Design a protein around this ligand. Sequence first.
Ligand code: CLA
Ligand code: CLA
Ligand code: CLA
Ligand code: CLA
Ligand SMILES: C=Cc1c(C)c2cc3nc(c4c5[nH]c(cc6nc(cc1[nH]2)C(C)=C6CC)c(C)c5C(=O)[C@@H]4C(=O)OC)[C@@H](CCC(=O)OC/C=C(\C)CCC[C@H](C)CCC[C@H](C)CCCC(C)C)[C@@H]3C
Ligand SMILES: CC(C)=CCC/C(C)=C/CC/C(C)=C/CC/C(C)=C/CC/C(C)=C/CC/C(C)=C/CC/C(C)=C/CC/C(C)=C/CC/C(C)=C/CC1=CC(=O)C(C)=C(C)C1=O
Ligand SMILES: CCCCCCCCCCCCCCCC(=O)OC[C@H](COP(=O)(O)OC[C@@H](O)CO)OC(=O)CCCCCCCCCCCCCCC
Ligand SMILES: CC1=C(/C=C/C(C)=C\C=C\C(C)=C\C=C\C=C(C)\C=C\C=C(C)\C=C\C2=C(C)CCCC2(C)C)C(C)(C)CCC1
Ligand SMILES: CC1=C(\C=C/C(C)=C/C=C/C(C)=C/C=C/C=C(C)/C=C/C=C(C)/C=C/C2=C(C)CCCC2(C)C)C(C)(C)CCC1
Ligand SMILES: [Fe+2]
Lengths: 31, 241, 348, 32, 30, 315, 30, 30, 143, 68, 75, 36
Amino acid sequence: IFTVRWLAIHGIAVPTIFFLGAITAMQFIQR
Amino acid sequence: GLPWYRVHTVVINDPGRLISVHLMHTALVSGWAGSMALFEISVFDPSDPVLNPMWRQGMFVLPFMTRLGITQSWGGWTISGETATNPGIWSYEGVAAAHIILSGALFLASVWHWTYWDLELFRDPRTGKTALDLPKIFGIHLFLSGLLCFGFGAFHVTGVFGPGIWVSDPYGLTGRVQPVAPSWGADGFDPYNPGGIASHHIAAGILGVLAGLFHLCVRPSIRLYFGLSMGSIETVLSSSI
Amino acid sequence: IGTYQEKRTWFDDADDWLRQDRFVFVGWSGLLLFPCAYFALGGWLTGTTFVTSWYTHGLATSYLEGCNFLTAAVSTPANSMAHSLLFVWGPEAQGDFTRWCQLGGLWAFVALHGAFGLIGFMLRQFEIARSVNLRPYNAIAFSAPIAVFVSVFLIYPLGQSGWFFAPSFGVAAIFRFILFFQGFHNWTLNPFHMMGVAGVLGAALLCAIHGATVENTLFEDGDGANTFRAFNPTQAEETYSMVTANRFWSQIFGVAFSNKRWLHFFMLLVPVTGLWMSAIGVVGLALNLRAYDFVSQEIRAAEDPEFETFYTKNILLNEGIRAWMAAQDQPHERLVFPEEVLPRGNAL
Amino acid sequence: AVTPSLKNFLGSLIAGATVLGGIALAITAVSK
Amino acid sequence: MEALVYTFLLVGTLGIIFFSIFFRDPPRMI
Amino acid sequence: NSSLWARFCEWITSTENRLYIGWFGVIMIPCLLTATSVFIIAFIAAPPVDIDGIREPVSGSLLYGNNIITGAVIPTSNAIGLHFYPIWEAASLDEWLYNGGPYQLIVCHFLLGVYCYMGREWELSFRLGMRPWIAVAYSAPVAAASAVFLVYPIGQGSFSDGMPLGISGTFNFMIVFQAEHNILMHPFHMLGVAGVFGGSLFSAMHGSLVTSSLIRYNIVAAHGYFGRLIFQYASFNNSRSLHFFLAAWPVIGIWFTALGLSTMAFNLNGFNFNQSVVDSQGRVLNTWADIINRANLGMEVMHERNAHNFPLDLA
Amino acid sequence: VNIYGLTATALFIIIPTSFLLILYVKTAST
Amino acid sequence: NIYGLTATALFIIIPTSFLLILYVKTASTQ
Amino acid sequence: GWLGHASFKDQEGRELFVRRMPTFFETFPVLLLDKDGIVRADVPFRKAESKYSIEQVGVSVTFYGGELDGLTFTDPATVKKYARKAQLGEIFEFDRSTLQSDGVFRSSPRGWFTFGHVCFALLFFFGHIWHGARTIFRDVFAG
Amino acid sequence: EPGLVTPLGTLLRPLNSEAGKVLPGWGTTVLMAVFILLFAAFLLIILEIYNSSLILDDVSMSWETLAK
Amino acid sequence: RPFSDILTSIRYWVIHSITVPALFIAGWLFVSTGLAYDVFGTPRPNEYFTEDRQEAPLITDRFNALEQVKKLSGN
Amino acid sequence: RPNPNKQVVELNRTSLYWGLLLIFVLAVLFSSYIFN
Ligand code: CLA
Ligand code: CLA
Ligand code: CLA
Ligand code: CLA
Ligand SMILES: C=Cc1c(C)c2cc3nc(c4c5[nH]c(cc6nc(cc1[nH]2)C(C)=C6CC)c(C)c5C(=O)[C@@H]4C(=O)OC)[C@@H](CCC(=O)OC/C=C(\C)CCC[C@H](C)CCC[C@H](C)CCCC(C)C)[C@@H]3C
Ligand SMILES: CC(C)=CCC/C(C)=C/CC/C(C)=C/CC/C(C)=C/CC/C(C)=C/CC/C(C)=C/CC/C(C)=C/CC/C(C)=C/CC/C(C)=C/CC1=CC(=O)C(C)=C(C)C1=O
Ligand SMILES: CCCCCCCCCCCCCCCC(=O)OC[C@H](COP(=O)(O)OC[C@@H](O)CO)OC(=O)CCCCCCCCCCCCCCC
Ligand SMILES: CC1=C(/C=C/C(C)=C\C=C\C(C)=C\C=C\C=C(C)\C=C\C=C(C)\C=C\C2=C(C)CCCC2(C)C)C(C)(C)CCC1
Ligand SMILES: CC1=C(\C=C/C(C)=C/C=C/C(C)=C/C=C/C=C(C)/C=C/C=C(C)/C=C/C2=C(C)CCCC2(C)C)C(C)(C)CCC1
Ligand SMILES: [Fe+2]
């Protein structure tokens, strides 16, 4: 389960989705 | 045969021509040093040392000679503008002539070593082939380097036997060649502390002597010997570069 | 197991595990490449997404502040820091994180971890080449990008007053850096940059011609019009006619390649030399050793008021760039230029 | 005399040593 | 003087190009 | 035997000549030689040319206190505009020199020469039984040259805005163009830069990989090496596909950058991002785009010293 | 106009040219 | 001095290059 | 020789200082500014009209120490020339006739040494890379 | 065939004689690694002191050190 | 476990459908709650210009920049 | 004693043309800066 492929994929994916959500949220803050 | 960029590869497989070629290069370097010293001494104008110093007249090798003690000249002038009481043998012209003579001697030695390349020293008695024990050569040369470093640090910079190095005030108003007392404290690692140079050279000479003795006595490990290609002359070139 | 058939230790087991073939080749150099490159990318992204440059440069550069992809960057530290390594535990940041990010240390973090990632990547290329038993010409080629990165991001800021004058990791920031060199260093006139641009354009030209020539001299190795399918990767026969291409290019241009090895080595050699020469030029710029002016033409222009060349017009444009840009480019100088002293074409 | 900068430097050294030891422990454990 | 030097350099480069185009080594066994 | 014309056309369309004199060649050769001769003569010696049209000339000849770097063939005078200015239309040869005729002559003959050069490339491709698409690849630099020398003067309404034929002229033209149009912020210039950098990268990589695999025609080991390196297995395992990609990348990049040039020729500039990030009160916050704007403003004020006389640069 | 520039240019033109001619003649004779 | 220095340099270099080329041509065929 | 320290004061007697030239700028405009930092005078570019020109504000220069000790010039041309020469730091006398000096600055041996040795180190990096690659891959290179 | 013989060569023969001999196993590689780590720490100390990123009370890190 | 088998398995889908939206809402809250402005020190769109300075900040000394950045920020 | 390590350098006409072109192009590029 905890193979190197899993580590690489999840380490690249989890921050990616977190930052995508962050950017989508920042799209709506009024200036 | 070989392209124009491999012509010097013919020397890789025999030590004698390697010695000759290295001697030739060293002779060329010494000759350049002597010639440049003579040229700069010819061009230098010591009339005004406060508004026309050496760095204002595009001097390159002159500051390097001045840094280690050589200040007087055979022309009757010092670098501080004062008259030369006694120039002595070790003057700018003397240093240049010494370098030229060394270049010539090295050139002659290079010619001799090129002529006689087949020497029994380079052949291993086990197989009768040209082979060099690189670890032991490195040990000997490291021992020599450590000895020279310790000597320079303890006898020249310190002023016990040699003249000393150049020391100046922070604003560069009154600077002269003075002996320095080595500083073994934390301030010895301050780059602007002159005593740090002497302390460094003494300590590094001692450690280099110890390391040379070690590398002279202890043989390398087989794993390390094969991993780093210690039997090949080209790895030494890469590490040295 | 070696030459003398000796025992096995921790190093042997680690070597067997690390070099084991899989989807993601780790290798010995992986331990250096993967974390450093990962943190370089992460720092760049988290800086261009949240961190600002208000306190270091007086600019707003982030997605949070309202900048888009083109006008977002990780700005360099303030000029007050000079050449401080700017560690998070360093005396400047005193261990604080939010101050450290606010103080500009993230640029140093990204740059240093990226440089070590580049070193690890070249080591990985060497390891792969050794494993596959091939000459490591790829590492020799990759030497040039490392030289360019070292010259521009490390040596040049060290030669200057601090990290402030380093390029900032952003599109508009890179454009600012380019215009700054144009205005101040006259970087277009430096012969080393000329040789570098010649090498880069020649590399692009060689790529285009090689591709077109190979694709337009194929052998009819199959049926149909789609030639891509008429190729067996395991075949031992050449897929294009070298003789026909040689004759065509010798009759069109005048000289043509006749050796495949020499041709591909030339393709390798041109861009590497170009960027190495560019790196040497930037190294020269780091010490203000500028190929700025031609003394003869400057003297002639000063003496003769009717003497105009494109060189003098370029000099005037550089002066205008400097005067109109230094007011906001370098806040630490606190320059306040009156509107009456700024160079300006009097015609209006 | 000890200095806060020196204390932070020693903390950085021990932190880097711990990171390197963790990497070594991980590769040793996975290897066998 | 310098203009003559530049002209000589350019003429020499063009002559080298001409010689390379025409007086080339014939290619064999491409 | 055969008539005179038959022998002439056999000689022209002969692959036994050292250099192929195609039917496109019969026009390429005279135009190119004429342009070369005029360019060399003007570069070596030519009087100052009134580029700005405001009765002040600039010198760009070696015999007029210039060197190789700063020498150039000055573009045509602004007063001429887009009018055809051949030699026979000038009252005297010295007037033709003063107004800047040689630039126009060289540009026209050179454009004709390069078009016929592309045609000749196609022709010799046809005569040797090759697939005729080398000319398509060659069209990208041809398109760029046409946009630089012809389309931009047409859009701007004068030949004085074209690229001078000199090393310093290139830099002056680039600084002018960035000042007036913001070339750096255009997506097409970004695509051109990407194409050039990628061309260099792929050239170096392909050369290294092929040379390394030419042991005592590329073997499959290089594909495995590339797959292991950048984790792109099966991305390029067909030699024809790889070489087609090598040809396609820089050509497309240069096509797009030339199109961006021709687009700006008609006053369609790049992206504008000055005064975008605004404080809550309403104050403007500077951005790197604003520093680029400041540099452009500095370039623009010293653009023409004594040519303009109205506040806005409509020309 | 300085002697140094002209002599440096002349030497840089001539010496590598002589070296290359030496090597080419050696190759062609063999 | 430019005339004399240039003449001396050319007289030293060119004939020596010619002689060296001839000798290297000769020495190639053992 | 040394011309002595130059002090600039306007008609009101307020002390003014020239903004020293930073290392980046090949050419820097000359600005006379008060102790607070607000610019009080400047040279109007080349052929521009100004409200803070040297003659309009009436700036005077006094020299303390050096060759010109005690002198006080008021000619606007002289004041402008000395302000231009003082924006570069201390004012010195030069004789650009013995060596036919061009007038543009050169670099000290420090800069030349640094440039040469950094370039040599950068090239020797590639040398190390190439020779190490040859050593590690001797088998494939030889045959 | 034998090479040339010199008294200096005879004297220096033992230095180059023992060529190719190795110590079986890993030898003293661990000691080498320890010394490398110590040298890296020392170099970091030097670089930080010189960079002013590590301030020590005794050191001054300026030209005024020459005034001591 | 080829990627085809990875996609096919329903356990991966059910374990990711409870985590992916969790991460998305975590990021959305991180932006919305204002924690991003605090952790990274990015000024809020109302505190760019404080009445004390009304101008862009300019750090002066490196050693004492820790206090200077906070006093400039108004903190 | 004759040296076994004996080899001869070769330089075909293409290499000569490349070298001449390189040196002449370098001279052309750097002459303007050398003369100044
Ligand atoms: C004993 C003979 C001798 C003596 C007394 C001198 C003395 C001098 N030489 Mg000369 N020289 C000599 C031999 C000698 N040279 C030879 C044989 C050569 C040919 C290679 C030269 C080539 C030469 C040149 C080209 C120049 C001089 C210069 C000088 C002057 C400055 C020296 C200096 O700054 O060194 C400083 C030396 C160093 C900084 C070397 C550092 C060595 C590194 C750090 C060692 C690192 C590797 C080490 C082994 C690692 C282990 C360390 C430890 C563990 C053991 C001085 C008058 C200069 C000058 O102005 O005179 C014209 C100059 O430009 N010399
Ligand atoms: C192999 C991977 C790798 C590499 C090469 C680097 C390299 C670097 N990092 Mg990164 N980093 C990494 C992994 C890595 N890091 C990881 C995994 C993390 C997450 C924890 C970080 C987090 C991180 C941060 C947060 C920062 C860095 C920084 C740095 C830089 C300074 C390093 C330093 O001062 O260490 C010094 C220490 C060593 C080099 C260790 C050497 C140990 C010696 C050899 C032995 C000494 C004896 C031992 C310690 C016993 C001590 C005894 C004691 C009790 C007296 C440098 C570019 C800093 C930087 O430059 O950013 C601006 C910084 O702020 N890194
Ligand atoms: C300690 C330094 C050192 C030493 C001993 C060597 C030794 C060697 N190198 Mg290495 N090399 C070095 C540094 C060194 N190199 C550096 C720094 C670089 C990067 C530039 C290289 C790049 C390099 C390559 C790419 C190749 C070698 C090759 C070789 C071998 C043959 C060289 C030859 O015949 O050239 C003969 C050279 C000429 C006949 C003409 C050279 C003319 C140039 C322009 C220099 C002109 C003289 C110069 C101005 C003098 C000043 C030098 C400066 C340092 C002061 C030989 C084993 C070759 C090899 O091993 O092939 C199998 C090879 O392919 N080297
Ligand atoms: C681009 C960088 C680069 C690359 C690709 C290589 C590549 C190579 N080197 Mg060279 N080398 C380099 C830089 C480089 N070197 C530098 C800078 C030095 C110091 C002068 C050396 C010294 C050196 C020696 C002495 C030898 C090699 C050897 C080798 C070969 C074996 C690999 C090896 O030993 O790696 C060595 C490891 C590295 C290059 C990277 C290690 C990086 C670690 C993580 C240190 C990090 C410290 C710390 C975290 C930094 C924090 C402080 C920071 C903020 C300043 C290979 C061809 C050997 C060889 O060819 O033998 C046949 C050999 O004997 N190299
Ligand atoms: C802008 C131009 C440019 C870019 C972007 C680029 C990029 C790349 N080239 C690579 C390779 C190469 N490039 C080569 C020759 C060249 N490359 C050139 C120009 C470029 N090369 C040129 C001109 C040449 C001719 C010599 C070769 C010969 C190779 C390879 O072998 C290699 C490859 O296999 O290609 C696929 C890859 C190395 C990946 C890597 O280091 O992973 C590790 C990741 C690291 C180290 C992190 C990078 C850290 C950087 C330095 C700092 C952070 C940068 C930010 C994250 C992004 C900044 C954004 C900007 C807008 C500022 C990567 C795709
Ligand atoms: C009076 C006069 C004349 C006035 C003009 C004055 C004037 C302005 C002169 C200009 C001065 C001038 C020359 C300036 C340039 C100076 C300059 C920048 C020099 C660069 C110097 C230098 C060392 C650069 C380093 C980088 C470098 C090595 C660049 C080399 C670039 C280069 C030569 C690229 C190759 C270009 C090119 C045309 C390649 C074509 C190759 C080709 C024919 C392939 C054909 C082909 C393809 C196949 O695929 C196959 C299969 C076969 C078989 C085959 O054949
Ligand atoms: C109508 C068209 C008329 C001709 C158009 C112009 C053609 C010019 C051709 C010049 C080729 C010169 C090659 C010499 C060296 C030579 O003879 O090369 C020969 C070489 C072929 O070598 P081989 O493949 O035979 O080599 C086999 C190996 O075993 C040994 O090399 O051709 C190339 O490398 C192609 C690259 C040419 C690159 C040319 C760049 C352009 C010239 C440089 C810029 C000039 C500026 C002048 C400014 C004043
Ligand atoms: C090009 C160049 C370069 C290089 C340089 C060099 C390297 C030089 C060298 C030089 C040299 C290297 C020189 C030498 C010289 C010498 C001389 C000039 C003379 C001599 C004389 C004499 C007279 C002597 C004699 C003798 C002797 C030897 C001793 C004994 C006795 C007798 C007498 C025998 C570079 C790249 C850097 C860059 C710049 C330019
Ligand atoms: C720094 C660091 C840290 C932290 C954190 C991290 C490491 C992070 C990372 C992070 C990351 C790593 C992130 C990432 C992100 C990513 C992203 C965010 C992406 C995005 C993308 C996009 C958005 C796309 C878009 C597009 C495209 C391109 C395609 C299609 C079209 C479109 C447009 C859609 C710490 C302090 C702890 C430690 C040290 C280091
Ligand atoms: Fe290919």
